[PDB]
Amino acid sequence: GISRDNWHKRRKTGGKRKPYHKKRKYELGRPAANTKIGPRRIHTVGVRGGNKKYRALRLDVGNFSWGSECCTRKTRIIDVVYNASNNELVRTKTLVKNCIVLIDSTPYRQWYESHYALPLGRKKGAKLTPEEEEILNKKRSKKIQKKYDERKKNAKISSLLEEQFQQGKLLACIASRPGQCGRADGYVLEGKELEFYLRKIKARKG
Amino acid sequence: MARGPKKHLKRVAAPKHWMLDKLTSVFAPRPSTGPHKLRECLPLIIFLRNKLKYALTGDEVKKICMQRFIKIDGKVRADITYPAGFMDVISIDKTGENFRLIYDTKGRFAVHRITPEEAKYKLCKVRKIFVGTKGIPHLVTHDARTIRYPDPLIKMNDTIQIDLETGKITDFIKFDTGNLCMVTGGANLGRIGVITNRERHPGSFDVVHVKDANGNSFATRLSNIFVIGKGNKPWISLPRGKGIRLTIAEERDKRLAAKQSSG
Amino acid sequence: MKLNISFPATGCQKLIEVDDERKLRTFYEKRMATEVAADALGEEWKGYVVRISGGNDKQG
RNA sequence: UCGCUACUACCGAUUGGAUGGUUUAGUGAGGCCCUCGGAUCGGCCCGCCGGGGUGCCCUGGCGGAGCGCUGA
RNA sequence: GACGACCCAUUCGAACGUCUGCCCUAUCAACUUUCGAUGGUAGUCGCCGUGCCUACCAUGGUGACCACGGGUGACGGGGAAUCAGGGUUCGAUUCCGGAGAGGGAGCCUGAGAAACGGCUACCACAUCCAAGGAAGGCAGCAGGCGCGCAAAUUACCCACUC
RNA sequence: GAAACUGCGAAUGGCUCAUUAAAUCAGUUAUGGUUCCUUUGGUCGCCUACUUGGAUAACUGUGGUAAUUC
């Protein structure tokens, strides 16, 4: 119906070619996923040669990663901020490859606190002392220090990172096609990208 | 016509090395899918009534194959058509006969009878090396056998002897200059001669010179060469003719010399 | 119309033909698979309830 | 040149007629996708009986309640 | 032994893409573009590559070496007739490739179809009816009407070839 | 052993030349840009298991429509 033909469209000279063969099943469209954020709705689509293709509508979880220290945990996908293909897609909260979105930022802290033995940015130390100090202080004899010594000075954590934990959000990059895969996935922004997209955000809105 | 795959091949579309006539009807057998390619096959039924003449109609072959007197590559087959090609062994155990499919210098599949002892193995070219899962290797051959754990110095364009009984190759030949080779396709076909020289081009369609024991030099593409044994010493039995590739004048001279068309 | 009364504990079923408006008024303006009292159908029914399973319009 | 017959082409009022294809705008069948919709049909919990077991349990049969929760 | 299933290889292919090759016409010389024309960047879609499609951005692309437009009683090729040499003319038609099943469009099933000996709708036709409804597509083999200068049996049979 | 469910084929063939001027098509090349029924060869162990759950056809019986492989 809606098709992805190539026997339409002008040649280089501005010429036209007269109608040749009728539309066929291997040149075919099928309308866009237009996936949002919400409760999971998945549809299974039969596709050529078999080998079913998953189309995801309204995901709310993706597997992001923090490849700086190589941990990857499942985290909720809150809202869109920047979509580098169009401005309109952000307004209706459409989710596609290479967007910039927000997450809860929760397990990354839990991992950091247990492994590097330090909290991130904090409102107050009063919260920590009755519980959440129980993990941070430890009763080991022998391997209070012995393990943790090797973790020291490999946890400088950068300025633009640390400030974001306090808000409870982090900026990560969709590196999947949700409409073809059936899953959202990605990597979290680091380095110069994370400097770049801040400037685009503050430029465009506000 | 086409919307999917075809299931007919006519008489006149079919290759000329099956030596078909033109006064039986429009269709020809067409080999069904298998390890060999249809411009290199000899379909089974063409061996049984257009060569050896046991059968006379296609319905007779259907009554023969069901009885399970036929084998191919030491296993039992039971259909009108099977796509056996170069270097396979047919085995009828009731008559005590064994055949081999190999090329005349004319370039067509002949009758090359052999001892049953010879018919316990065949010679197979290596074409591709492919590392499988968890650090295990594979071979790929033209008869489409995947033989795991080969020796780690065997590479493509070599040939390997396979025991039909147990698989799992016992020995091999290494591709080297001065080893004896047979041709399997192209304009030169059925010629036997040593390698002599190689030629390489980065890209594709490298060629391979050849010379025989009649003092003639010729060349062919790389991928039409098949190794048969070390220099002037085949590790297989050879038919009459022996890759000489006589001119037409000399062939005339032989026939009028023996005066041979009667016994 | 007719009816096809059916007894599903012998597997038997029989016909009967009526055109009395009142007895059929019990069935009128109701969808399939509703149950209604068949006691309206006469004096040989007095604790029967039936279920209508459908039928055939005119022109089949 | 003018007069006589066969014959062919051209111009032409009629803003000719007929048939076919393009083209703006409006209207738009049918299917597909998406978002809703819930006719209707089941399952699992509490009574009585049957079987097994410790008034109660499991399973089967039968009825009714909330039809509660749940699937199609 | 039989059947089924996941993956890899193989076979039969399928689908896109490279370079070169074309009949008549200028009383057809400029053509193509936000109704994407050419390119860049990102995304959607698709079996995959790709302006295929969308957003943003650039202003290109093609032509006297004939573009663009129009015409063709133009399906293409393997070939055929004539012929000293060079040519000319023909190729609907038994092999190979392609396109189409009254005209258009959409779609189901399946590994493979935008299928018509499958389906749904519109349009042009034509059939039955108790007038409430229902059913159809011979460019398959025969056969009929029509059209014309112009073209065969409503025959016999799966034995051969598949 | 009729019938009926299930698997498979019906996308092959046959026919026509209407459309179609870099299109079709031919020679030559490319999948390191992809899909592939089938055959062939490999792949085959991180109060229920002495075998689990509940419906449909043929069939039996009663019908409707002028008419249909309804």
Swiss-Prot record, chain A:
Subunit-level organization: Component of the small ribosomal subunit. Identified in a IGF2BP1-dependent mRNP granule complex containing untranslated mRNAs. Part of the small subunit (SSU) processome, composed of more than 70 proteins and the RNA chaperone small nucleolar RNA (snoRNA) U3.
Protein name (record): Small ribosomal subunit protein eS8
Keyword Methyltransferase included in the entry's annotation: no
PROSITE patterns reported for this sequence: RIBOSOMAL_S8E
Modified residues (Phosphothreonine): T129
Cited PANTHER family: 40S RIBOSOMAL PROTEIN S8
Protein species of origin: Oryctolagus cuniculus (Rabbit)
Gene Ontology biological process: translation
GO cellular component: cytosolic ribosome; membrane; nucleolus; ribonucleoprotein complex
Modified residues (N6-acetyllysine): K36, K127
InterPro entries: Ribosomal_eS8, Ribosomal_eS8_CS, Ribosomal_protein_eS8_euk, Ribosomal_Se8/biogenesis_NSA2
One example GO MF annotation: structural constituent of ribosome
Role summary: Component of the small ribosomal subunit. The ribosome is a large ribonucleoprotein complex responsible for the synthesis of proteins in the cell. Part of the small subunit (SSU) processome, first precursor of the small eukaryotic ribosomal subunit. During the assembly of the SSU processome in the nucleolus, many ribosome biogenesis factors, an RNA chaperone and ribosomal proteins associate with the nascent pre-rRNA and work in concert to generate RNA folding, modifications, rearrangements and cleavage as well as targeted degradation of pre-ribosomal RNA by the RNA exosome.
Ranges of Basic residues composition bias in the record: 7-25
UniProt keyword terms in alphabetical order: Acetylation, Cytoplasm, Isopeptide bond, Lipoprotein, Membrane, Myristate, Nucleus, Phosphoprotein, Ribonucleoprotein, Ribosomal protein, Ubl conjugation
Cross-link Glycyl lysine isopeptide (Lys-Gly) (interchain with G-Cter in SUMO2) per UniProt, renumbered positions: K169, K192
Swiss-Prot record, chain B:
Subcellular localization, as worded in the UniProt entry: Cytoplasm; Nucleus, Nucleolus
Summary of subunit composition and partner proteins: Component of the small ribosomal subunit. Part of the small subunit (SSU) processome, composed of more than 70 proteins and the RNA chaperone small nucleolar RNA (snoRNA) U3. Identified in a IGF2BP1-dependent mRNP granule complex containing untranslated mRNAs.
GO molecular function: rRNA binding; structural constituent of ribosome
Statement: the UniProt record of this protein carries the keyword Ribonucleoprotein: yes
Domain of life: Eukaryota
Gene Ontology biological-process entries: translation
Chief location bin: cytoplasm
One Gene Ontology cellular component: cytosolic ribosome
Keyword Acetylation part of the UniProt annotation: yes
Protein function: Component of the small ribosomal subunit. The ribosome is a large ribonucleoprotein complex responsible for the synthesis of proteins in the cell. Part of the small subunit (SSU) processome, first precursor of the small eukaryotic ribosomal subunit. During the assembly of the SSU processome in the nucleolus, many ribosome biogenesis factors, an RNA chaperone and ribosomal proteins associate with the nascent pre-rRNA and work in concert to generate RNA folding, modifications, rearrangements and cleavage as well as targeted degradation of pre-ribosomal RNA by the RNA exosome.
Residues annotated with N6-acetyllysine modification: K233
InterPro entries associated with the record: KOW, Rib_uL2_dom2, Ribosomal_eS4, Ribosomal_eS4_C, Ribosomal_eS4_central_region, Ribosomal_eS4_central_sf, Ribosomal_eS4_KOW, Ribosomal_eS4_N
Keywords: Acetylation, Cytoplasm, Isopeptide bond, Nucleus, Ribonucleoprotein, Ribosomal protein, RNA-binding, rRNA-binding, Ubl conjugation
Sequence ranges assigned to domain S4 RNA-binding in this UniProt record: 42-104
Name listed for the protein in its UniProt record: Small ribosomal subunit protein eS4
Family annotation (CDD domains): KOW_RPS4, S4
Gene from which this protein is expressed: RPS4X
UniProtKB/Swiss-Prot annotation, chain C:
Chain positions of cross-link Glycyl lysine isopeptide (Lys-Gly) (interchain with G-Cter in SUMO2): K14
Domain of life: Eukaryota
Similarity comment: family membership: Belongs to the eukaryotic ribosomal protein eS6 family.
Signal peptide: none
Residue positions, PTM ADP-ribosyl glutamic acid: E35
Full-sequence range covered: 1 to 60 of 249
Free-text description of this protein's post-translational modifications in UniProt: Ribosomal protein S6 is the major substrate of protein kinases in eukaryote ribosomes. The phosphorylation is stimulated by growth factors, tumor promoting agents, and mitogens. It is dephosphorylated at growth arrest.
Protein name: Small ribosomal subunit protein eS6
Quaternary structure (record): Component of the small ribosomal subunit. Part of the small subunit (SSU) processome, composed of more than 70 proteins and the RNA chaperone small nucleolar RNA (snoRNA) U3.
Compartments in which it is found: Cytoplasm; Nucleus, Nucleolus
Function: Component of the 40S small ribosomal subunit. Plays an important role in controlling cell growth and proliferation through the selective translation of particular classes of mRNA. Part of the small subunit (SSU) processome, first precursor of the small eukaryotic ribosomal subunit.
